[PDB]
Design an enzyme around this catalytic site. Structure first.
Site, PDB file in Angstrom:
ATOM      1  N   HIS A  83       0.562  -1.226  -0.020  1.00  0.00           N
ATOM      2  CA  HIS A  83       0.299   0.011  -0.157  1.00  0.00           C
ATOM      3  C   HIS A  83       0.831   1.591   0.121  1.00  0.00           C
ATOM      4  CE1 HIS A  83      -2.898  -3.202   1.493  1.00  0.00           C
ATOM      5  NE2 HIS A  83      -3.222  -2.180   0.598  1.00  0.00           N
ATOM      6  N   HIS A 123       4.474   7.046   7.227  1.00  0.00           N
ATOM      7  CA  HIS A 123       4.168   6.244   6.173  1.00  0.00           C
ATOM      8  C   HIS A 123       4.072   7.568   4.800  1.00  0.00           C
ATOM      9  CE1 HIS A 123       0.478   6.249   7.475  1.00  0.00           C
ATOM     10  NE2 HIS A 123       0.520   6.710   6.191  1.00  0.00           N
ATOM     11  N   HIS A 156       2.129   9.095   1.350  1.00  0.00           N
ATOM     12  CA  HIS A 156       1.026   9.237  -0.059  1.00  0.00           C
ATOM     13  C   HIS A 156       1.210  10.019  -1.143  1.00  0.00           C
ATOM     14  CE1 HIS A 156      -2.384   6.940   3.393  1.00  0.00           C
ATOM     15  NE2 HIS A 156      -1.812   8.151   3.828  1.00  0.00           N
ATOM     16  N   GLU A 195      -4.081  13.313   0.192  1.00  0.00           N
ATOM     17  CA  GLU A 195      -5.455  12.799   1.372  1.00  0.00           C
ATOM     18  C   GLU A 195      -6.149  14.070   1.721  1.00  0.00           C
ATOM     19  OE1 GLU A 195      -4.691   8.902   3.700  1.00  0.00           O
ATOM     20  OE2 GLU A 195      -4.614   8.333   1.655  1.00  0.00           O
ATOM     21  N   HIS A 250       2.391  10.983   7.137  1.00  0.00           N
ATOM     22  CA  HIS A 250       1.358  10.751   8.099  1.00  0.00           C
ATOM     23  C   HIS A 250       3.052  10.220   9.103  1.00  0.00           C
ATOM     24  CE1 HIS A 250      -2.446  10.939   5.835  1.00  0.00           C
ATOM     25  NE2 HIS A 250      -2.145  11.546   6.239  1.00  0.00           N
ATOM     26  N   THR A 286      -7.274   6.667   7.649  1.00  0.00           N
ATOM     27  CA  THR A 286      -7.741   6.243   5.705  1.00  0.00           C
ATOM     28  C   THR A 286      -7.278   5.627   5.192  1.00  0.00           C
ATOM     29  OG1 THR A 286      -5.162   7.396   5.430  1.00  0.00           O
ATOM     30  CG2 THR A 286      -6.444   8.996   5.822  1.00  0.00           C
TER      31      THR A 286
HETATM   32  C1  LIG Z   1      -1.422  -1.440  14.802  1.00  0.00           C
HETATM   33  C2  LIG Z   1      -2.514  -1.102  14.323  1.00  0.00           C
HETATM   34  C3  LIG Z   1      -2.652   0.580  14.040  1.00  0.00           C
HETATM   35  N1  LIG Z   1      -1.442   1.158  13.234  1.00  0.00           N
HETATM   36  C4  LIG Z   1      -1.822   2.399  14.018  1.00  0.00           C
HETATM   37  C5  LIG Z   1      -2.666   3.530  12.862  1.00  0.00           C
HETATM   38  C6  LIG Z   1      -2.206   2.833  12.432  1.00  0.00           C
HETATM   39  C7  LIG Z   1      -1.807   1.580  11.841  1.00  0.00           C
HETATM   40  C8  LIG Z   1      -2.515   0.135  11.100  1.00  0.00           C
HETATM   41  N2  LIG Z   1      -2.278   0.796   9.741  1.00  0.00           N
HETATM   42  C9  LIG Z   1      -1.644   1.276   8.862  1.00  0.00           C
HETATM   43  O1  LIG Z   1      -0.164   0.597   9.518  1.00  0.00           O
HETATM   44  C10 LIG Z   1      -1.462   1.800   8.033  1.00  0.00           C
HETATM   45  C11 LIG Z   1      -2.384   2.868   8.227  1.00  0.00           C
HETATM   46  C12 LIG Z   1      -2.140   4.402   7.483  1.00  0.00           C
HETATM   47  S1  LIG Z   1      -3.224   5.555   7.673  1.00  0.00           S
HETATM   48  N3  LIG Z   1      -3.062   6.800   6.098  1.00  0.00           N
HETATM   49  O2  LIG Z   1      -2.483   6.750   8.863  1.00  0.00           O
HETATM   50  O3  LIG Z   1      -4.822   5.410   7.868  1.00  0.00           O
HETATM   51  C13 LIG Z   1      -1.894   3.734   6.420  1.00  0.00           C
HETATM   52  C14 LIG Z   1      -1.690   2.959   5.649  1.00  0.00           C
HETATM   53  O4  LIG Z   1      -1.147   2.560   4.353  1.00  0.00           O
HETATM   54  C15 LIG Z   1      -1.343   3.673   3.444  1.00  0.00           C
HETATM   55  C16 LIG Z   1      -0.775   1.408   6.941  1.00  0.00           C
HETATM   56  O5  LIG Z   1      -1.160   0.503   6.734  1.00  0.00           O
HETATM   57  C17 LIG Z   1      -1.303  -0.335   5.381  1.00  0.00           C
HETATM   58 ZN   LIG Z   2      -1.569   7.535   5.986  1.00  0.00          ZN
END
Ligand SMILES: C=CCN1CCC[C@@H]1CNC(=O)c1cc(S(N)(=O)=O)cc(OC)c1OC
Ligand SMILES: [Zn+2]
EC number: 4.2.1.1
Length: 258
Positions: free
Chosen positions: A62, A92, A94, A104, A117, A196
């Protein structure tokens, strides 16, 4: 058939697995700078990244993610709209296929080339999983990227992306200092919102800095060489990994500045 950013699995499809996609507190949003009100009750924002411990960099199919040692209070966010102490767990980005899209959040409908972010969790909930389920569990510090002059603090990220081209690849990424990704000003907008990406939890306090960082065209071109696909699958360039603006509904965006 898992979620992504394509025509057939992208943000218009996510509500079928994640019905909260049509909820009352979704992110991102358009920040109407005329509507957003200065809030004198906002305490000073504290971005305390001096003791940060970066660990690894990962292509998760992603985005790419840099994770941090959050087993103790090292790199933390406090103040502004926040109560208590939020630990940095990862950052990370976008980004877009062209320099006029990628962010975003938007500002008066303006899209930036990319958005950083920095993801933090509330230490009152003891771990990030438990935090991620609480209405005040997460705080994401969002920073816009515009294309212009190079950002020297980003170059160590750009130079390792060759090593994590495909989904599932990771590399060592110790001793990276996320202070080098910050703009000069901590002026911000804040509002209650969500992740997001799936599972789109409504558990995020968003803090979106007003001042973008400048990165060079060469730096953002390197983001666009990543792949969504795994090693020895057909090549799909990792571009346009952004969710569009969602309805603001009954929320107020508050400004830290006059
Ligand atoms: C252990 C789960 C919760 N942690 C802390 C919050 C986000 C993270 C989990 N998800 C991500 O790592 C994650 C989070 C975001 S975002 N824009 O912060 O929602 C984006 C992403 O990849 C575009 C991610 O990986 C797919
Ligand atoms: Zn993000």
């Amino acid at each position: 058939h898992h979620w992504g950013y394509g025509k057939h699995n992208g943000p218009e499809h996510w509500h079928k697995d994640f019905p909260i996609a049509k909820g009352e507190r979704q992110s991102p949003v358009d920040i109407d700078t005329h509507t957003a009100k200065y809030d004198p009750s906002l305490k000073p924002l504290s971005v305390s990244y001096d003791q940060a411990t970066s660990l690894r960099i990962l292509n998760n199919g992603h985005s790419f993610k840099v994770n941090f040692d959050d087993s103790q209070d090292k790199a933390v966010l406090k103040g502004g709209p926040l109560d208590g102490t939020y630990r940095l767990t990862q950052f990370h980005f976008h980004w877009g296929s062209l320099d006029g899209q990628g962010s975003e959040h938007t500002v008066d409908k303006k899209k930036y080339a990319a958005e950083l972010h920095l993801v933090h969790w509330n230490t009152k909930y003891g771990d990030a999983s438990k935090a991620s389920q609480q209405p005040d569990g997460l705080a994401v510090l969002g920073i816009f990227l515009k294309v212009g002059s190079a950002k020297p603090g980003l170059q160590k990220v750009v130079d390792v992306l060759d090593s994590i081209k495909t989904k599932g690849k990771s590399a060592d990424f110790t001793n990276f200092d996320p202070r080098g990704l910050l703009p000069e000003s901590l002026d911000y907008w804040t509002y209650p919102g969500s992740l997001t990406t799936p599972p789109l939890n409504e558990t995020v306090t968003w803090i979106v800095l007003k001042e973008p960082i400048s990165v060079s065209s060469e730096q953002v071109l390197k983001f666009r060489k990543l792949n969504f696909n795994g090693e020895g699958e057909p090549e799909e360039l990792m571009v346009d990994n952004w969710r569009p603006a969602q309805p603001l509904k009954n929320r107020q965006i508050k400004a830290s500045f006059k």
